[PDB]
Structure formats: structure tokens, C-alpha cells
Amino acid sequence: ASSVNELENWSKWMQPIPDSIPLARISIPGTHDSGTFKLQNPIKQVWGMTQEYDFRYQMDHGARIFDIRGRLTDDNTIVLHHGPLYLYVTLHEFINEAKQFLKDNPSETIIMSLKKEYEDMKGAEDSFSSTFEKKYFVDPIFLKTEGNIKLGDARGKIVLLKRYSGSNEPGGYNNFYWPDNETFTTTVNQNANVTVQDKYKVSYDEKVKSIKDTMDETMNNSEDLNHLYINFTSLSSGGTAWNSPYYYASYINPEIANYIKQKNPARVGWVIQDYINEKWSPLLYQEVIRANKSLI
Numbered sequence: 080a081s082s083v084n085e086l087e088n089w090s091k092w093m094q095p096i097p098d099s100i101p102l103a104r105i106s107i108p109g110t111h112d113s114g115t116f117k118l119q120n121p122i123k124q125v126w127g128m129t130q131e132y133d134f135r136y137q138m139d140h141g142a143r144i145f146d147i148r149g150r151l152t153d154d155n156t157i158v159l160h161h162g163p164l165y166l167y168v169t170l171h172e173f174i175n176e177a178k179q180f181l182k183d184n185p186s187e188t189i190i191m192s193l194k195k196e197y198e199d200m201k202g203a204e205d206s207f208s209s210t211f212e213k214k215y216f217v218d219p220i221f222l223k224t225e226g227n228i229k230l231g232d233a234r235g236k237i238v239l240l241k242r243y244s245g246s247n248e249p250g251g252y253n254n255f256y257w258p259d260n261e262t263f264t265t266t267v268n269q270n271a272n273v274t275v276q277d278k279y280k281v282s283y284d285e286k287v288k289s290i291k292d293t294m295d296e297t298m299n300n301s302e303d304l305n306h307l308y309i310n311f312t313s314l315s316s317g318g319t320a321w322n323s324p325y326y327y328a329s330y331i332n333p334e335i336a337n338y339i340k341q342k343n344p345a346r347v348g349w350v351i352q353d354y355i356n357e358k359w360s361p362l363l364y365q366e367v368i369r370a371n372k373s374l375i
């Protein structure tokens with residue numbers, strides 16, 4: 080499209096953006112541990128809970144990237160897990176919400192990151208990858224194209240970001256290095272590069288700095304369409320009391336929203352965050368979406 084007013088529409092913000100823009104260049108908000116919104120048991124919350132509303136609320140709020148952690152069970156299905164604890168949500172449940180959303184708003188698309196969160200249940204017939212690829216990925220909403228995925232080829236489909244090994248079906252983003260608790264950079268495809276800031280378990284100070292620092296690198300490298308930037312603003316720690324990802328999120332979100340507001344960047348990258356809601360006055364997900372003004 081041509082009007083900027085279109086980015087203020089959360090359910091369809093990707094509509095005004097050109098069909099030829101690679102998904103890498105787009106500033107896409109996302110959610111960290113997307114399926115933890117059903118954890119309503121106090122002690123489970125202060126540790127696991129990273130969202131308070133459902134996938135659809137999340138999507139109607141501009142979120143187009145979901146952090147999906149699963150696990151194989153006896154019934155040979157894949158469900159959502161937060162470490163060793165079962166979130167009362169399943170993979171099918173995600174894929175259906177994404178479909179209803181996607182049919183109501185065909186101009187959009189969604190990136191689903193899948194990571195094998197826990198070890199498979201003893202009575203599983205197949206491995207994790209094979210089960211996901213033979214029982215789910217074979218579904219047509221999943222885009223089976225690889226390479227520097229353009230927006231045009233992805234509208235209506237579900238782009239996959241692989242955080243599991245042993246894949247056999249071609250499609251979406253190929254699995255890559257991803258070391259533990261740091262910011263790194265690797266190659267994804269022949270034509271692609273990834274800079275990830277994933278410092279979970281770090282002090283607030285270092286966390287805030289890592290976000291802005293990685294954010295500064297993208298603002299500058301803005302016109303490099305073949306280079307993804309994933310920027311997790313989430314920081315989980317030994318919560319228990321006001322130290323839970325909610326407390327941190329109540330500071331880290333407004334903080335980073337404004338930082339983007341004043342800097343008026345032309346690119347912010349893929350900002351994966353916790354607690355997406357409408358409480359934190361400045362709104363991170365909205366600022367990240369707005370920084371796409373430069374593509375229209």
C-alpha cells in the first residue's frame with residue numbers, strides 16, 4: 080500500500096508493506112515463550128509465565144513471530160512446555176489460532192519458531208522432527224520455500240524458524256548455531272546472516288545494554304536486506320518475588336519502546352518480548368511496527 084496510517088492497524092499492519100521486501104528487513108514484534116498464558120498457579124507463574132493473554136490477543140496486537148517450545152508425548156502429539164512443566168496448550172491449538180487469524184487477515188503472515196523444549200516421553204514412536212514433519216509440517220499453511228523469504232511468498236502461510244535438528248523437509252528458515260545465553264552471529268542459508276541477542280539469565284544492566292547495543296547495530300545496517308536481527312528483550316531470573324519476568328518486563332519494555340521512539344530508526348529488527356499487553360504506557364510492539372514507516 081502507500082499510506083502510513085495502515086501500520087496503526089494491528090490486525091493487518093503488514094498490508095501496506097511491499098510484496099518484495101524480504102522478511103529480514105521488516106521490523107516484526109514477537110513474543111517470548113508465547114504459550115505460557117494459561118499458567119495461573121502462583122509459583123508456576125513467577126517462574127514460567129511470560130504472557131498473560133492468548134495467541135489471538137497476541138496477534139491482534141501486531142505479534143507476528145511466536146516462540147513455540149514443544150515436546151513429544153505418548154499419544155504421539157506435540158504439546159507446549161516450559162522446561163519440565165506442561166503448559167496446558169498444544170501445538171494443534173497454536174496452528175489453529177494462526178489459521179483463523181490468517182484467514183481473517185490474509186494480508187498477514189506469521190513466523191513460528193519451534194524448539195524441542197524437553198525430552199520426548201518414553202513411549203514415543205518417532206523422533207521430534209519426524210513427528211512434527213509427518214503429522215504437522217505437511218499441512219499446506221506451512222510455507223515450504225527457503226532462502227531469503229520475501230513477504231509476497233509468505234502472506235497467508237506460516238513461516239517456520241527451525242530451532243530443532245534432524246529436519247528433512249525443506250521450508251522456511253534452516254536451523255543454525257545459536258549458542259547458550261549470549262549474542263552471536265552466524266549464517267542461515269547461502270544468502271542470509273543472523274545476529275541474535277539472547278542473553279537470558281543476566282543482570283538488568285547488562286540486559287538493557289545488550290538490547291540497545293544490538294538495536295544500534297541494526298539501525299545502522301538498516302539497508303542490508305540479507306541479514307536478520309533477532310532481539311529478545313526478555314530476561315527471566317530467579318523470580319519468586321518481584322524479580323519475575325513481569326517485574327523486569329515492566330521496566331525493559333517502556334524503556335526500549337521510548338528508545339525507538341526518540342531514535343526514529345528505519346529498522347529495529349525482530350523484537351521478541353515478554354508480557355505483551357497494554358499496561359506499559361509507551362508500548363514496545365507499536366513502536367517496532369511504526370519503524371517500518373521507511374518501507375512504505
Ligand SMILES: O[C@H]1[C@H](O)[C@@H](O)[C@H](O)[C@@H](O)[C@H]1O
Nearest residue numbers: 111112194277279311313315
Ligand atoms: O530459557 C532460555 C530463554 O527462554 C531463551 O530466550 C531461549 O532462547 C533459550 O533457548 C532458553 O533456554
